[PDB]
XYZ file of N, CA and C in Angstrom:
48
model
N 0.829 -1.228 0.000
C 0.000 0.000 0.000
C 0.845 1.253 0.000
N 1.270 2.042 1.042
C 1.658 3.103 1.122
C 2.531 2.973 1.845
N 3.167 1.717 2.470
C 4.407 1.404 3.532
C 5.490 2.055 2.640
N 6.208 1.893 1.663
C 7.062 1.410 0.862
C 6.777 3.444 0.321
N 6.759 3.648 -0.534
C 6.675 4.945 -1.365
C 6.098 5.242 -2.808
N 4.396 5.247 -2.466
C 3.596 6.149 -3.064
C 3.806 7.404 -2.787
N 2.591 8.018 -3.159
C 1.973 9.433 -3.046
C 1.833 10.089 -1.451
N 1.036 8.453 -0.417
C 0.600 8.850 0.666
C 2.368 9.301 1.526
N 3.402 9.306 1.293
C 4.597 9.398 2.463
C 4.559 11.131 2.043
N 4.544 11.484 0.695
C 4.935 12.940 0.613
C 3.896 13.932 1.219
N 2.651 13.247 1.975
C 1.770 13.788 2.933
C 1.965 13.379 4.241
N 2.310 12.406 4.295
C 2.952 11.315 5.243
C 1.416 11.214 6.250
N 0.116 10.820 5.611
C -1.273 10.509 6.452
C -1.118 9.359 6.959
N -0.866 8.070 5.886
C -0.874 6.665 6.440
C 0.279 5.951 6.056
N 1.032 6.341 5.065
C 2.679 5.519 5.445
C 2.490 4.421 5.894
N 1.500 3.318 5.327
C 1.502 1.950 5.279
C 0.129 1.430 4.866
């Protein structure tokens, strides 16, 4: 999902 580096880390909401 978003653990690793999508979109969600450069908002950093759910970072997984």
């Amino acid at each position: 999902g978003c653990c690793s580096n999508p979109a969600c880390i450069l908002n950093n909401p759910n970072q997984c």
